Design a protein around this nucleic acid. Sequence first.
RNA 1: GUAAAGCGCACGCAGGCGGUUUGUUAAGUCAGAUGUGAAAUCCCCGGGCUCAACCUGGGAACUGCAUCUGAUACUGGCAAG
RNA 2: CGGCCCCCUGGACGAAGACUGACGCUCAGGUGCGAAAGCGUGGGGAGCAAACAGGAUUAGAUACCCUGGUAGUCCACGCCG
Lengths: 240, 205, 123, 129, 58, 166
Amino acid sequence: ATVSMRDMLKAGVHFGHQTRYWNPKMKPFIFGARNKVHIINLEKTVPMFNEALAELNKIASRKGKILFVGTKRAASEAVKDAALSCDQFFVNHRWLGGMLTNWKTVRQSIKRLKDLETQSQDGTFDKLTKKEALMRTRELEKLENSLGGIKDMGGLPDALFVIDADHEHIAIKEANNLGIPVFAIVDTNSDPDGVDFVIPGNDDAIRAVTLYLGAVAATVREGRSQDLASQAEESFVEAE
Amino acid sequence: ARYLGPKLKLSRREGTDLFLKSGVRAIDTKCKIEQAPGQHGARKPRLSDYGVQLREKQKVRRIYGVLERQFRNYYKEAARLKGNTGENLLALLEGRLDNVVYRMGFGATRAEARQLVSHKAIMVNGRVVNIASYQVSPNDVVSIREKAKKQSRVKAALELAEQREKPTWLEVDAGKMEGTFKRKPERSDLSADINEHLIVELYSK
Amino acid sequence: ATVNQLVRKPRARKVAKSNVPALEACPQKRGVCTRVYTTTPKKPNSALRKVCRVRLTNGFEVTSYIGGEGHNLQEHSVILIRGGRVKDLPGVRYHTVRGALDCSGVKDRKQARSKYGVKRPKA
Amino acid sequence: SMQDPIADMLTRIRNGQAANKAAVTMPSSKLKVAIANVLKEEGFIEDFKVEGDTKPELELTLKYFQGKAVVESIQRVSRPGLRIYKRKDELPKVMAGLGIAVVSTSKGVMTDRAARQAGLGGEIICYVA
Amino acid sequence: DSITSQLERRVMFRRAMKRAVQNAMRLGAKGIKVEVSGRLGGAEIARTEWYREGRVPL
Amino acid sequence: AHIEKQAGELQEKLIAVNRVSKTVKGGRIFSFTALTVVGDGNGRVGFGYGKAREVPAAIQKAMEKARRNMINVALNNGTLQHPVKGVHTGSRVFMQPASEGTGIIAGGAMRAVLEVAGVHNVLAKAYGSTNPINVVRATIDGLENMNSPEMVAAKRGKSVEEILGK
RNA sequence: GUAAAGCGCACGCAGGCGGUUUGUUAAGUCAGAUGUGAAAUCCCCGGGCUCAACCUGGGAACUGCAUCUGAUACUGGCAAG
RNA sequence: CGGCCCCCUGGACGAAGACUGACGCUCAGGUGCGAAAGCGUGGGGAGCAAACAGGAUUAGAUACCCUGGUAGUCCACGCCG
């Protein structure tokens, strides 16, 4: 399945932008600097990436729903491009690390958002005084920004897609405790964690990260469409 | 050696009647025992590892009609003829002449039963054996000395006892004032609260 | 360190099982009282507590607390002493045996009679 | 100089697993070879080769076929300096019989089971933990 | 009355007051505030406790 | 966060409970402390000291700190057979290789802690801090492998993959 | 490291230790061979005096010793690398 | 150990040609060795400065903060380093 190897090379040819310093624990997949810029070994990452993209395919028939985490002020647009659906959920700009174990609160703020979003949208948000009505509009905004990558999600995700292992140490802990496996894409100047499967890679600038995540998503996403179309065909066969 | 004195007190903690003072007053009914005894009972008590050990040694002293001091010799013999120590110690506790006398019915209490030992009303092998600590084994015969086969209190005790204190490991006859002890029991037959292997771990260290 | 090193350098050791001082390798010993001190002790917790210096019959001199209950000791009496430190009181490595000789406790008894004193009142 | 090459052998296996390798190579004693065979048949090492340069040299393969699971450290007890020798009857199964002693007997190096069934004593080389 | 009754008979006051609140808001209170005092714990000096839940604006 | 052994249904063995304070104007402490060891009534890892505004939260903190938010070294089955020493955060428990099952004796509340911990089968003396809030670590420092099962073929357990790897 | 505790530092004989290979030896190593190790109150197996305490026959770690024979897997001695 | 250099000389740090072949490791005993002042005798003392004087500080002011000012600080070898 040569198709995974095309995307890895097609992404990987930005040759880095960061200095000749790298995370010691990534050292195997790192080729030597050219004039003080870090260059990943491109060939040595192409065998990893093919193993990863078949594993994503197998979980497509297990899949509930996907949660793209590790979002931050530079990685969001690259997650926007990855999702292409609402079978898979995301936020744009920032992410609050951990949702998996304090779900109690998280479902209680989703119910506060959708109640007050429906009052705002009808035009019936105005009660007591205008001060109070504007003060509620101001809390509706605040919820929307706090909630954007969960405010549509049906429960807890069957896998977790992390681009940034570095502010997500608490989310990875909690996800594993809920009995969910992590599928990770780690940088050459970031430390890899306690995760179940890794894509070794380099996430410098918007042109690499949109493709890595897009390749990861295709296998699993169109797997999911085909498992669901099969559930239709296993029942409809009876009636035909 | 029969201790008695402050006798009921140890049952009043224990919640077993310890076989001392039975009848119509073994655990409650006309006995005032654990029905709010005293002028206190509001506070939380505290236990330790030495507290459950102490409680279980207290149980076993009175149910066999023995002492701490008697039980030290019972251990000095348990080690000397070696096996599992806790098993050995109970064989010897249950092997007392006072306990064969008690389970047959000839006194329906520990104090009664041991009195009929000591006060020469009990004979083993047709000779008077006045020692409660005398060792008795399967298919041995206990019988009653002549000038004590006129006890009104013996006759009375056997009938209080009739198929409520009398076990199946023995035989007795209430007319002839004599019986055969046919089998020495172990903890599977008896009560299973007392434990004698744990008490030897305490006294060894 | 090595194991060899330790044969060549002997260890420093103390007894972890004894610390209260005691004379003639025994639990009790006799001496005549010399002096009594009303004294105020170590710690912010304070009383006018009563202690004696006693002159033992084995050639040492120690200060002992009058324990058990009360103060009934005379200043020159031959009394029986027992090792046992009564912590914050001055120079107290010993206590006085309330049931022996000139010593006796105060008021009835529901306690010991070895220490606290008095002949039999109850079981 | 290092006095013990057999402490080094063990340190090579330990640090071998910790550094996420699969092989460790070193200079070899006759004694080292004789040791590696008992470990290999007792399944605490996987394989070895013997190869020459200027003297004999041992290359071995780790218990990183499966990582860590019952053994987390292997240490030698009769070394340079402190030695302890054990008789034919007191050859131990270390860790309440969740382990072995590697035992040099006057017949050659074998495990504690086989030295005791034969009733042969000697010098107790190394334990697993 | 119901939270003093526990305390009078020395049963509970650590959770007796919280079940009061639970039982109150389920019939219609948008919020309840509770303060328990007395000689709580059998202590020779006086103690306080308090608990607020929902809203009690003043 | 931190993952533990199997259980089904849990026993909240509260061994000790206490109260803290430093009450003053504005920012203050006034909470309660609780100590619990969590297990299944034969053998499990998990130990938590926690605290909160009152007795109900204090205990729920403590039961969370056992089950998560705590570094432990693992057990398999409700019995020990890898008796060895160790240190975890200064607290030292020593266990010499001897009989399983019988010989169990440990003072105060510690004989009850050892029954939920899985190391009441093999045990020996403690050193370091001798307080019951920190020495319950028996199944952690006193067990330096992640499984110690009841079949003696445990020492052939890793062996069967090693000689197949030959 | 800081809790009591690394020599103030180098160089290095005596003692302790000894990479790697062969020859050679066998102090310690272990196995073999055989003798000694009274007596119970201790221990293990018996037994008796009303049980027991107590005393005891046989066996014994007699917690202690003995030397020859054999070995070279180990460390030590010595010779050339 | 502080300007920088030379003369004598130690020690390190690289690298090729070439050379010996455990000549190794550690180190009771051990001889040898000073940051500073102290210090024996010699040189030196421009500035600064303990004391001593006198101010200023203050519930007092030996501490604080100041001014004069001597030994000292500065060199060479030496003494328990």
